Symmetry: D2
Subunit: 447 residues, 4 copies
């Protein structure tokens, strides 16, 4: 109506602010189920699921009803020292129940994934102080890992584009190579050998720093924004092994994988591993209300709550920690996740979608490989297949392919040289077929 031509007074995250690029906009006006409609009336399948978070689809009546009911009762009250409200009790019980297998004991709520990560990092340090080991302060993380954009989360991030414009951040953060078969420093194409390489490097890094100086390691069970990097099956079991050997806390960044996208209620659980700390957001409310959560296992909960002196004071949290309306939405969302077995649907429909996309590798030289697990999938676009040289996004080919997919009726997300598929976990087989058709059309014209 007026959004096509007006000057833009906000900035898009993860994009150029330069004109004329900044003048261009795709304005989404409504969402229903797994389809979204722009201001011109053009409808498209939500192949990006909002931002890997609208996992139950748009406009679920039961979630809207839960929100409205809580607004009528208590939209907001704080949860600071000694004060709380029913919904934060309800959700904390629910989450610790859902993750009893991992022995999760306490939750610290927030409003997003960057919050949940920042919380894990800060509280990991407090765990060690409360335990009498204040020298345990350094953090380990993986190349291509993405953990939000707070200064702590950014410090442990493994992609340079998020660093270049912000100077020196947290010291004592150390990066390990990721077990990425398609691109790794050893050109190692054997998953088991690659795991062995990464674990040896990890041990050598720990030996170099001294285990007694390392607080925690943080990693995504499947690395999302870094390019949907699916680790070898034995990597996470060995991550847990190394952490146990040296007492280091294992932080699973489950912001994307939490609540079913990779085929299991937790990505780490999918690999047969129990972390010490869980970071959750995105799918926890399916995007309806901002919410994040950091969960701590009994080991951590007991140490902090029994800390001497000031070490048991938890001087960290947010005005909106435990927001009643966000909690009410999460409770309704999680009911749907479990009721409709969306982790199982993601595993099944995701496996089909991955298989049906493999012909693209054959047919188009620019498609280096297609990888995924559940309903997170990446098309890794390269200029030639020997060195795996990524296309440069500034040349615009990934965006043009995406544009053509949108014209074919499916919205997908280009991140760097990769096309990311992360649709709602309610995706059906027919809708998966529509995604394949739109993508084949896009590469046919712009590949």
């Amino acid at each position: 109506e007026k959004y096509k031509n007006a000057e833009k007074k906000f900035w898009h995250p993860m994009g150029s602010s330069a004109a004329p690029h900044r003048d261009k906009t795709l304005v989404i006006a409504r969402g229903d189920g797994n389809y979204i409609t722009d201001i011109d009336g053009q409808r498209m399948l939500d192949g990006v699921g909002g931002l890997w978070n609208v996992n139950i689809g748009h406009n679920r009546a039961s979630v809207k009803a839960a929100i409205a009911a809580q607004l009528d009762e208590l939209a907001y009250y704080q949860t600071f020292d000694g004060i709380a409200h029913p919904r934060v009790f309800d959700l904390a019980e629910r989450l610790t129940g859902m993750f009893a297998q991992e022995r999760m004991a306490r939750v610290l709520f927030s409003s997003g994934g960057s919050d949940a990560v920042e919380t894990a990092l800060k509280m990991a340090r407090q765990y060690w102080i409360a335990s009498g080991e204040p020298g345990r302060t350094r953090f380990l993380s993986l190349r291509n890992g993405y953990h939000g954009v707070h200064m702590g989360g950014t410090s442990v991030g493994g992609n340079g584009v998020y660093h270049y414009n912000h100077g020196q951040l947290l010291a004592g953060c150390h990066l390990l190579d990721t077990p990425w078969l398609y691109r790794n420093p050893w050109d190692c194409r054997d998953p088991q050998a690659l795991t062995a390489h990464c674990i040896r490097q990890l041990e050598e890094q720990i030996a170099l720093l001294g285990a007694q100086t390392i607080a925690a390691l943080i990693a995504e069970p499947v690395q999302g924004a870094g390019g949907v990097i699916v680790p070898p099956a034995d990597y996470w079991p060995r991550l847990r092994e190394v952490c146990d050997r040296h007492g280091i806390l294992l932080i699973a960044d489950e912001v994307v994988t939490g609540f079913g996208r990779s085929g299991c209620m937790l990505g780490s659980r999918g690999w047969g591993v129990a972390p010490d700390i869980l970071c959750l957001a995105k799918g926890i409310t399916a995007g309806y209300i901002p919410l994040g959560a950091t969960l701590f296992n009994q080991r951590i909960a007991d140490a902090i709550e029994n800390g001497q002196g000031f070490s048991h004071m938890i001087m960290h949290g947010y005005t909106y920690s435990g927001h009643p309306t966000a909690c009410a939405a999460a409770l309704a969302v999680l009911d749907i996740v479990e009721a409709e077995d969306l982790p199982g649907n993601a595993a099944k429909v995701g496996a089909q979608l991955l298989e049906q996309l493999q012909p693209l590798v054959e047919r188009y030289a620019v498609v280096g490989e297609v990888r995924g697990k559940g309903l997170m999938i990446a098309l890794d676009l390269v200029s030639d297949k020997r060195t795996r040289q990524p296309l440069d996004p500034a040349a615009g080919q990934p965006s043009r392919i995406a544009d053509e997919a949108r014209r074919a009726g499916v919205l997908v997300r280009p991140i760097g040289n990769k096309i990311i598929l992360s649709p709602p976990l309610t995706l059906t087989r027919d809708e998966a077929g529509l995604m394949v058709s739109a993508l084949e059309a896009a590469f046919a014209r712009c590949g």
Copy 2:
């Protein structure tokens, strides 16, 4: 009603996690207007306004309706590179218009005040890189300043309790003394002389660090969680001037003071000052939906959007940046702020409340002074009025006084040695009188 006895599976921010303290809970079930009700049916005036944020009162029909309407249209969609939706256009236009006097040009939305600060700090760094001065990296802030609990915000915080349990954070953050008449290093009780002292210290710190290494200074127009410290009237003008003398960006943390609590739509505007960056949250949605906002003036917008190479890429933001439902709530909330002149009501009723509390200084030895501006007020409790020695919060006397106020029907917040009053800005004179009576009863019993 298992909320009374069940094990608590969440942690309270800003409180002891040790048993038996953590077993105690005040469970708030409902809220309407300026009153809240616990699970036992006990009503109390919300003297803390949630957490300085329920500024229009609880349970406003028009805000609830705006939320429901947006949920029916589009609960959520992203705003990353090239994608947006109607509501974020609407609110960005609204905010830049409200703050046209301050030449605000661009908004980067988030979900809270800690986000808004963290965004300010990171984008301040990027401004200087885009401007060709990547040596500009250090941050200045004030003792007793509070700027959230992300690692960046924590690094510039001016109260030790938020640092003790989390190790070394951001380097290059330097604290200045706050122009606090009641407690300052000069024992200076003249506002004009105190300002001069602080400005001299600031100049000396800049000279020591080198202006060319300093990115920005961040400050609250009235310091909230630090104890409602109202600066001399001429401090913020001089603060603005020294920053400009050296090109340093002035970040106004308006998370509490933004939208009227101190008597003006902006605290900085109330002092006659235009910052380069504004941080907003809390009152922006009156707590109904999590939302934060960081606003940048034309100076900053022009530099970044014209930056060379990668410096115009804004690789910072959050999944819920620009959340449609949060934006819809904000639009409805701001209509009420402006329609009902809540900044004006805060100025008038707050001044009344402040004068009505002064007799407490007379009557009770523990009350060192009572200060405030608008509807943020602090009772500064001391063991000795000559040295102004603060009571120890861990000894519990502030909490015991607060407990008695609750029994009298008014919930107030002890932060350290101070009792904080921060009720909704719709507070009436009658309700202010009720607050005075409850506090008189509390000190009579526990003072």
Copy 3:
């Protein structure tokens, strides 16, 4: 010497044409130095606060030659040593038994000695089971060398501007400088109270459990000869103890008598936990530095658990035999000739004899000192104490004219610094007063 200069002068502009000029010193004897043209001047700066016994002492030269004949150098790393390092370590721990000094870690200069103090301070807390103790406190205008650690805790900006971000967790306090301080307080006891309260507030802000050490000069040298109130160091010691913080006394300048006592800290009646020594320890004849640790620190590390008892810090030239032999001879002279006492007596005479300059010349704001470290603080306005700007060059012009009058003095910022050998006689003190009177008469 009209050739291109292939070395850089520390603490100066490297730009041409400034860099083309040089005062080339060829000879030194007693308290005088002579350039290549025979231009002769009293060494009013004592080299760099270090030629404390004068130039060309036969007994020191002989001690050096004797050690060169026996063993010029051998290492002292794990399990290996040599006679001289035994001798000097015994000598120093004996001289500083009052302070309960137990172990020495030698080096080659003051920056080394500071850097060693900082690193070993960190190790003390790790060995003690408090590895969260990492932050360092220091004073504005403090100078602690130019290694990255020493620079990080320095309190003068000119040493930071060109080197970017260094060590994190270093926090500066205001210095108890009577002539210029944030309280405009010229009363020793009141200024002390102001500074101590500030110190307490910063510790509360950081948390004692995160702070490794505080480092300070008993008299701040390069910062402008700032003599603290008499009760400052006692209360400094007490606040540090209140919180367990290690007190590092940077005695690189004050060590071995310049301020009137064998240690500046001892002169204030204080025992630090760590001593940093250099400059005067060898009177400049051979590079040497020393860091001494009290029984508290030595015992904790030697009983440390795990790896905390491994001292993986030190220098190839730690314990250098020839440097140690030189120090033993130098220290013999310090004690034999009671040079701390001479610095006290003659320094007081010089200080009193300079006071008329304050009255006589508007540019001389004040003259302060203790022993034989003295500063003339030059100002454009005595009401505000506005310092002259050195970039306008008046301090250098005054210094130049002092040189023509036969005395070399050092302009640092707006201050003229006097730090001559501790063998200074009453006549030579008078010569310094005279040369300065001549300089201000023309260039003041």
Copy 4:
């Protein structure tokens, strides 16, 4: 007599050793040195197989150097070199060094008293170079695993061996470590020099891309890594280091504290690989240990930028009281005369090759000797528990020290660092002395291997 030094209480600490009792009670007390032999307080003589600490490169007790020292003490033992003041010897030595390193276009020297100083000076002045150049964002440092660069906080921050870090907490931020091109132990298990180089260079490129070249000030490396275990890089590694640095404008700092002045067979290790760095760090052999001296040299590129720096950026506010020490400079001039007159770089190359060849049979004869590597007269015996797993001996079990102890009784003092026995004798070593080192080591492994 030296009797009073036996059993006497030690009031000093040994660097790089346990301070715990009873270990600290043991001491080998050296009483005198002559040529390449040292004598302990019991009268036992041994070849100085460690050359002091890779620094007594011309031998002990050189009359001409002692005379040069005594002569300068009589003339001017010390005077400062700060702003506008200097003395003849610092002119002499600066000219000498810039002349010796004209091939590398070295233009300015900033003197100090040791290798840690020289590294620290390089790091700080690298920072100043970029600020003077208008690029104050260039602040990060790159270095190699197993690299050793002294023990100041800067040098320690870029060090690549954990034992020097464990006890000192967090130091300089923005320091990043790369794997070293170490044939015997590397993440690729690659024993092919060209292939290992390619692996390391690609890792370096990836690290630069991740950080952003515009944030990186300098890379520092040893032409042969000394204390890390005498790791001789592939021949094409340093040429490719220079390439990558040039690709991104990064300053190349050659830590020549050990290799400077001939130990690896060339007056500079970097020159030995055919490379010109931007900054040279020198110490140890520059005075052969007679007087502490270090030097950091800067090429014309750096010198011009700083001397033309705008605002305050041309002020060099870094240096040491003993920078340019007249007596140290006089000693250096006499030492360097000997280095060139006796062609000690050539002797190190020739005798070093002989010694290295003669030691290879030990690999076959003794299971604990994993390999013997070296270049010139820096050589390491890399001790392992068995050649199948290549597991390094753990020094805390004490076998490397026991082997060293046996070598000492056989008449040669050698250095155990971790699992490695280091040989670094004076560069005046003769063929007979090389043979003595082989025999003493043969005896040591026969008894304790």
